Amino acid sequence: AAALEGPYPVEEIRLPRAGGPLGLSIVGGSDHSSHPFGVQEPGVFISKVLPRGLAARSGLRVGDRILAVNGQDVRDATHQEAVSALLRPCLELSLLVRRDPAPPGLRELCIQKAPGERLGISIRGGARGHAGNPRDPTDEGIFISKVSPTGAAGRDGRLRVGLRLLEVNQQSLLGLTHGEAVQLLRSVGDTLTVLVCDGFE
């Protein structure tokens, strides 16, 4: 395996197995779309590192591409092959990861809505929908298509046309349809916590 001299350096990170959770989340797998992680090169990615849990203290970062789990190559592993490998009983968890960067513009937004105030946005894309990304028709992600200047999002100022939506109130939008994404955004309540990154212009 080399898997060496790539765009980004690789490194074996050991996580101790003394009870408790890893404090990480993974997306991707050969049977999945992992946008915006590895758009040209698919795989398994660390999508979320809990601060400051086991994964965080060990040096794992959001965007990390997992190449091997305890010596087991997982570059072509399905999402469940990867998950099971990470859950298999072992004295110590060895992760060969490649230090791919997190998707550009990755940031969490907390948006406040006054009582009776609407969000004032519309979205495009979604799994098995119409291409929300003009630059890439294979991309089935969720993007902001419109922002009303007077709505909550408009007055907040941070949401804008083009941004990719990743999760809403801790609920992931990956693999979700347009309608499933819409019902999440509508039932969000007084406070919208949304994970976004740059998508298009």
Binding site: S25, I26, K48, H79, V83, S172, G175, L176
Partner: peptide
């Protein structure tokens, strides 16, 4: 949910 797994 089915596409992101927390561990």
């Amino acid at each position: 949910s089915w596409f992101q797994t927390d561990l």
